[model samples]
Target chain A: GEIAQSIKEIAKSIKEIAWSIKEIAQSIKG
Target chain B: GEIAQSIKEIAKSIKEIAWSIKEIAQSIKG
Candidate 1:
């Protein structure tokens, strides 16, 4: 369960990085 | 507990962006 949880956490981190990238893109457009 | 705490933080963050992505994807999907 813990290992599964860890992987999920990592996936979540990657999602955050994706959001940050999206934000940067928007900022650039503005 | 440290591991659990760290993992939960990561999951919560990912869940945030998962929500964001779902919104964007829905926009595109729509």
Candidate 2:
């Protein structure tokens, strides 16, 4: 039941990681 | 040239992060 909810949380974490990579790239490009 | 190499490094780091997250999810499913 809540496994779906837990999986959604994981998706959020993955997106956060993507955001972090974008920021890291921006810093490296500077 | 250095920027491209650095970006590849970042991709590797991101893949590592993805592996960690996968492990975390697997443990959660246990």
Candidate 3:
């Protein structure tokens, strides 16, 4: 239970990071 | 040309999915 919950929290941080990446990356006009 | 653009869009959806999953996952904060 703890591990599963920790994974979820880790995943959340990953999502936030990913979105921040996506926003910046999409704006690249590359 | 088509493949490149297609992959990009695919990533958009994938990013979207990942973000959604991440939202649900990250909320666990256990």
Compose the digit string of candidate 1's lDDT tens values, residues B1-30.
356666666676667666666666655565
The local lDDT score (0 to 100) that residue B22 gets in candidate 2 is 58
Reference-based lDDT, each prediction = 0.64, 0.57, 0.55
Measured by TM-score, the strongest candidate is 1
Best by lDDT: 1
| Span of 10 residues, lowest total lDDT, candidate 3 chain B | B21-30
TM-score of chain B of each: 0.65, 0.72, 0.61
Q: After superposing candidate 1, which stretches have Cα over 4 Å from the reference?
A: A1-30
Q: What TM-score does model 2 achieve against the real structure?
A: 0.45
TM-score of 3: 0.41
- Cα-based TM-score, every candidate: 0.50, 0.45, 0.41
lDDT (10s digit) by residue, model 3, range B1-30: 244544455566567857655555554441
Tens digit per residue, CA lDDT, model 2, B1-30: 575555555555656687675555444443
Residue A22 of model 3, lDDT score: 60
Error (Å) of candidate 1 at residue A27 is: 8.3
lDDT of 1 by residue, A1-30 (tens): 587666666766776686795675454433
